[PDB]
Design a protein around this ligand. Structure first.
Ligand code: ZN
Length: 108
């Protein structure tokens, strides 16, 4: 579609921006870039619930300067509720049909 781009938002697919919300939390950088997360409350698809977006989207709103300060401890554990998807071990576990894990990690 488009060849040249100056600075457009990532709304084509929530995943990309949604992954941006987590990747951001990983390194925990200033609330500068973060500010492009507030725009996600406007348009996106729109993305539906029942997946785990409140976590990454509520954080951005709760932050917005002021909260940048050093966190306590639970905060650090909040990032793990999104981390569960990165592995998808418990995601399937529900009924007696699908397996807890589909693909296993390789290591030598
Ligand atoms: Zn979205």
């Amino acid at each position: 579609g488009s060849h040249m781009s100056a600075g457009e938002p990532h709304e084509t697919d929530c995943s990309e921006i949604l992954d941006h919300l987590y990747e951001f939390l990983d390194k925990e950088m200033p609330d500068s870039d973060a500010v492009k997360f507030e725009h996600h409350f406007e348009e996106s698809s729109p993305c539906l619930e029942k997946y785990g977006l409140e976590q990454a989207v509520k954080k951005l709103v709760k932050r917005a300067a002021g909260q940048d300060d050093v966190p306590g401890d639970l905060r650090a554990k909040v990032m793990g509720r999104l981390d569960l998807i990165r592995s998808g071990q418990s995601v399937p576990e529900h009924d007696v049909a699908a397996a807890p894990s589909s693909s296993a990690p390789q290591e030598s």
